[PDB]
Amino acid sequence: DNWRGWNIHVDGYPNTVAMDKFAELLAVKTGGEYTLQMFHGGTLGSQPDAIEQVRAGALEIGNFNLGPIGPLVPAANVVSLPFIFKDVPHMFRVLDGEAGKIIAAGMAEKGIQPLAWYDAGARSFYNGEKPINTPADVEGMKVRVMNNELFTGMIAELGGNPSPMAFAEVYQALKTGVVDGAENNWPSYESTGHFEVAGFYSLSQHLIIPECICINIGTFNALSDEMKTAVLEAAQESALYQRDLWNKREAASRAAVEAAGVVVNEIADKAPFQAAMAPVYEAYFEANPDLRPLVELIQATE
Numbered sequence: 001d002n003w004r005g006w007n008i009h010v011d012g013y014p015n016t017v018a019m020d021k022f023a024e025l026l027a028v029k030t031g032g033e034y035t036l037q038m039f040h041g042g043t044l045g046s047q048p049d050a051i052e053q054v055r056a057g058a059l060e061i062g063n064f065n066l067g068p069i070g071p072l073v074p075a076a077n078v079v080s081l082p083f084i085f086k087d088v089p090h091m092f093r094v095l096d097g098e099a100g101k102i103i104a105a106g107m108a109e110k111g112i113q114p115l116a117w118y119d120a121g122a123r124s125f126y127n128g129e130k131p132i133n134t135p136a137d138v139e140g141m142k143v144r145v146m147n148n149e150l151f152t153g154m155i156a157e158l159g160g161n162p163s164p165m166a167f168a169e170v171y172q173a174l175k176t177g178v179v180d181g182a183e184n185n186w187p188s189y190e191s192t193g194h195f196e197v198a199g200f201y202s203l204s205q206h207l208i209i210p211e212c213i214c215i216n217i218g219t220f221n222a223l224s225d226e227m228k229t230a231v232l233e234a235a236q237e238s239a240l241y242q243r244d245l246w247n248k249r250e251a252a253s254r255a256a257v258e259a260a261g262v263v264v265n266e267i268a269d270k271a272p273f274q275a276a277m278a279p280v281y282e283a284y285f286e287a288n289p290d291l292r293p294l295v296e297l298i299q300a301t302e
């Protein structure tokens, strides 16, 4: 009845405050029959490890980015395709439609039930050496990515050298030059300290990946109908709050790092970055023929 949950983020981060709210709302709506203890800051382990713990039932709850879920769940892997959404509002429109049900089904199929969707904005490149404006600027650059071969591909097609690595280890790696750069949204770039050791941020906005509040499906299925309704309502309400927190944080984060001296650039012509992803998309299609229509469905959505 007393659950444990994972979140990788630090204090005050939108996801952190929102998962606390999820835990609070779970206890309220279930009259104390179900409670949740959060372990924030990744103190329970890396994201892939936590995903395995939730799937195995060693942990009940996670706030997981879908990036590291992709290698486990083909349908979820669709949101890890570079340049598949035009922007965050587009993503949410796609997720509240048929794409979302398919992604959820695929997830539930691998033992992990999404309960609500969180915003994590768009991810963009950052490094300590120079601005990125064209794919040529990425050639030879060692860029850290999350643990998903779609992202190793993305970097290789821009001529970089990908380095999949745990999020926790990125600050040191940038500090010592083991990697040259990485990529993420404004709040992560700011909260982890990466901006202090990688002060060029280039708005490629190459990935727009949602997150979820995740529950082990056995845990969820064992609930009564009314408790499932309570858990879903808590999750959904936490996520609406998270989305409000998120939009204020993106601006505050961006402003704080610009003030600290970060040099920001837009990418005027993103088209060559997109064009270079042909082989990554085509290589997902070859691995997952059945899911070509999921990709087309998303790209067809306004």
Ligand SMILES: O=C(O)[C@H]1O[C@@H](O)[C@H](O)[C@@H](O)[C@@H]1O
Residues within 6 Å of the ligand: 008, 047, 064, 065, 120, 146, 166, 167, 183, 184, 185, 188
């Ligand atoms: O880059 C990463 O590993 C991290 O990126 C952040 O944006 C996600 O919120 C976090 O779940 C990931 O662990």
Ligand SMILES: [Cl-]
Residues within 6 Å of the ligand: 046, 047, 048, 165, 166, 167, 168
């Ligand atoms: Cl990680």
